[PDB]
Design an enzyme around this catalytic site. Sequence first.
Site, PDB file in Angstrom:
ATOM      1  N   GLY A  14     -23.430 -30.771 -56.452  1.00  0.00           N
ATOM      2  CA  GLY A  14     -23.946 -29.424 -56.562  1.00  0.00           C
ATOM      3  C   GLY A  14     -23.377 -28.705 -57.765  1.00  0.00           C
ATOM      4  N   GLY A  16     -23.930 -24.527 -59.467  1.00  0.00           N
ATOM      5  CA  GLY A  16     -24.641 -23.271 -59.492  1.00  0.00           C
ATOM      6  C   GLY A  16     -23.765 -22.146 -59.983  1.00  0.00           C
ATOM      7  N   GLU A  17     -24.258 -20.935 -59.765  1.00  0.00           N
ATOM      8  CA  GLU A  17     -23.614 -19.713 -60.214  1.00  0.00           C
ATOM      9  C   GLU A  17     -22.212 -19.531 -59.639  1.00  0.00           C
ATOM     10  OE1 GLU A  17     -25.897 -16.390 -58.966  1.00  0.00           O
ATOM     11  OE2 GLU A  17     -24.442 -14.877 -59.624  1.00  0.00           O
ATOM     12  N   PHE A  18     -21.957 -20.168 -58.499  1.00  0.00           N
ATOM     13  CA  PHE A  18     -20.708 -19.973 -57.772  1.00  0.00           C
ATOM     14  C   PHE A  18     -19.826 -21.215 -57.793  1.00  0.00           C
ATOM     15  CE2 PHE A  18     -23.979 -17.279 -55.753  1.00  0.00           C
ATOM     16  CZ  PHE A  18     -23.463 -16.055 -56.129  1.00  0.00           C
ATOM     17  N   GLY A  19     -20.116 -22.121 -58.724  1.00  0.00           N
ATOM     18  CA  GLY A  19     -19.269 -23.271 -58.976  1.00  0.00           C
ATOM     19  C   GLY A  19     -19.968 -24.594 -58.752  1.00  0.00           C
ATOM     20  N   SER A  20     -19.218 -25.670 -58.943  1.00  0.00           N
ATOM     21  CA  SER A  20     -19.727 -27.012 -58.720  1.00  0.00           C
ATOM     22  C   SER A  20     -19.065 -27.615 -57.490  1.00  0.00           C
ATOM     23  CB  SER A  20     -19.485 -27.876 -59.957  1.00  0.00           C
ATOM     24  OG  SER A  20     -20.003 -27.228 -61.105  1.00  0.00           O
ATOM     25  N   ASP A 134     -23.957 -13.500 -44.471  1.00  0.00           N
ATOM     26  CA  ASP A 134     -24.663 -14.207 -45.537  1.00  0.00           C
ATOM     27  C   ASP A 134     -25.341 -15.473 -45.021  1.00  0.00           C
ATOM     28  OD1 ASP A 134     -25.462 -14.258 -48.278  1.00  0.00           O
ATOM     29  OD2 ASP A 134     -23.939 -15.781 -48.701  1.00  0.00           O
ATOM     30  N   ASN A 139     -26.560 -21.888 -46.929  1.00  0.00           N
ATOM     31  CA  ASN A 139     -25.252 -21.761 -46.284  1.00  0.00           C
ATOM     32  C   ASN A 139     -25.209 -22.445 -44.927  1.00  0.00           C
ATOM     33  OD1 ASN A 139     -24.327 -20.376 -48.456  1.00  0.00           O
ATOM     34  ND2 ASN A 139     -24.343 -18.348 -47.494  1.00  0.00           N
ATOM     35  N   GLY A 155     -17.329 -16.539 -47.295  1.00  0.00           N
ATOM     36  CA  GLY A 155     -16.834 -15.606 -48.291  1.00  0.00           C
ATOM     37  C   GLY A 155     -17.172 -14.152 -47.996  1.00  0.00           C
TER      38      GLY A 155
HETATM   39  C1  LIG Z   1     -22.504 -22.315 -50.250  1.00  0.00           C
HETATM   40  O1  LIG Z   1     -21.064 -22.347 -50.102  1.00  0.00           O
HETATM   41  C2  LIG Z   1     -20.389 -23.545 -50.215  1.00  0.00           C
HETATM   42  C3  LIG Z   1     -21.049 -24.791 -50.224  1.00  0.00           C
HETATM   43  C4  LIG Z   1     -20.333 -26.004 -50.345  1.00  0.00           C
HETATM   44  N1  LIG Z   1     -21.019 -27.187 -50.332  1.00  0.00           N
HETATM   45  C5  LIG Z   1     -20.999 -28.198 -49.379  1.00  0.00           C
HETATM   46  C6  LIG Z   1     -20.205 -28.170 -48.178  1.00  0.00           C
HETATM   47  C7  LIG Z   1     -19.396 -27.211 -47.805  1.00  0.00           C
HETATM   48  N2  LIG Z   1     -18.686 -26.368 -47.485  1.00  0.00           N
HETATM   49  C8  LIG Z   1     -20.262 -29.259 -47.283  1.00  0.00           C
HETATM   50  N3  LIG Z   1     -21.058 -30.315 -47.546  1.00  0.00           N
HETATM   51  C9  LIG Z   1     -21.827 -30.394 -48.653  1.00  0.00           C
HETATM   52  C10 LIG Z   1     -22.629 -31.533 -48.843  1.00  0.00           C
HETATM   53  C11 LIG Z   1     -23.437 -31.640 -49.986  1.00  0.00           C
HETATM   54  O2  LIG Z   1     -24.225 -32.743 -50.188  1.00  0.00           O
HETATM   55  C12 LIG Z   1     -24.323 -33.760 -49.172  1.00  0.00           C
HETATM   56  C13 LIG Z   1     -25.295 -34.826 -49.730  1.00  0.00           C
HETATM   57  C14 LIG Z   1     -24.969 -35.219 -51.196  1.00  0.00           C
HETATM   58  N4  LIG Z   1     -25.708 -36.442 -51.647  1.00  0.00           N
HETATM   59  C15 LIG Z   1     -24.861 -37.489 -52.290  1.00  0.00           C
HETATM   60  C16 LIG Z   1     -25.653 -38.815 -52.364  1.00  0.00           C
HETATM   61  N5  LIG Z   1     -26.948 -38.635 -53.091  1.00  0.00           N
HETATM   62  C17 LIG Z   1     -27.745 -39.891 -53.101  1.00  0.00           C
HETATM   63  C18 LIG Z   1     -27.764 -37.474 -52.614  1.00  0.00           C
HETATM   64  C19 LIG Z   1     -26.922 -36.184 -52.479  1.00  0.00           C
HETATM   65  C20 LIG Z   1     -23.462 -30.603 -50.950  1.00  0.00           C
HETATM   66  O3  LIG Z   1     -24.274 -30.756 -52.061  1.00  0.00           O
HETATM   67  C21 LIG Z   1     -24.705 -29.592 -52.826  1.00  0.00           C
HETATM   68  C22 LIG Z   1     -22.651 -29.464 -50.751  1.00  0.00           C
HETATM   69  C23 LIG Z   1     -21.827 -29.337 -49.607  1.00  0.00           C
HETATM   70  C24 LIG Z   1     -18.921 -25.975 -50.473  1.00  0.00           C
HETATM   71 CL1  LIG Z   1     -18.013 -27.411 -50.620  1.00  0.00          CL
HETATM   72  C25 LIG Z   1     -18.249 -24.737 -50.457  1.00  0.00           C
HETATM   73  C26 LIG Z   1     -18.985 -23.536 -50.333  1.00  0.00           C
HETATM   74 CL2  LIG Z   1     -18.158 -22.065 -50.316  1.00  0.00          CL
END
Ligand SMILES: COc1cc(Nc2c(C#N)cnc3cc(OCCCN4CCN(C)CC4)c(OC)cc23)c(Cl)cc1Cl
Length: 260
Positions: A14, A16-20, A134, A139, A155
Amino acid sequence: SRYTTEFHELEKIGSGEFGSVFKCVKRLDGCIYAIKRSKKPLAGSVDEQNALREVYAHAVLGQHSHVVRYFSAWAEDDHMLIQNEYCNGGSLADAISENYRIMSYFKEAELKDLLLQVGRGLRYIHSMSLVHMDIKPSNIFISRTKVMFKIGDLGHVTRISSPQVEEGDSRFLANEVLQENYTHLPKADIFALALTVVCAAGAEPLPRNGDQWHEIRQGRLPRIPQVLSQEFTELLKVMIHPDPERRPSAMALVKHSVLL
Ligand SMILES: COc1cc(Nc2c(C#N)cnc3cc(OCCCN4CCN(C)CC4)c(OC)cc23)c(Cl)cc1Cl
Ligand SMILES: [Cl-]
């Protein structure tokens, strides 16, 4: 660097605007974690507030099966790293996008399950005198083998008694919160959950403002193309009732008949 010492980065999943967000294996336990990397928030700022709101929320709530677990947070250089539970099914927003790509969708039985599970999450959060503020598809996360929905991104979490509102996404925001009325905040989560399910049901992207926006806050449910039971559609409708007091509470939602 703690990050490379403790974890091995597998892929970026991932940005976006709020990090990777990175899929990482922790070397010691061999487990997978979702690690978010972002700009170290300015000291004394809103961003810092969000970050601290988040730590406090997880500190209060602890571990719950419908809340994404929060393990550790630290900084390296000018960046903040947060170690979270990895939800291998991604966000609901990304699943909806996937459903569109391959012409699939969430049938009613699955929508109820979504509504029920996130509802149980809300019920617990509200039981602890907190509100999420939110709720939206980006989310909600999915953990599968068969499926667990989990509330992420704490958050914006604040206390019902003496709240500090960082208002959520305008597309999911109840009118009374926009009106700076913070007296029934748990019902704002409920309102947002309904529209979250509405997106998952395949509704058109929600309006940020204008006529369509107000029409929804008048209690009008957005158009959904798939056929749903009237009992189910009426449930979604009362959840966006303009009077917050008429909306079911989380505890009332989870005890509701229409859900499994
Ligand atoms: C919005 O806020 C937040 C969002 C997050 N984000 C995530 C959390 C949490 N928490 C948990 N689980 C996540 C799982 C994700 O992908 C799972 C599938 C990936 N596949 C890998 C293999 N290939 C083939 C297809 C894609 C993911 O991806 C964008 C973001 C996750 C965090 Cl880390 C912090 C905050 Cl604050
Ligand atoms: Cl407007």
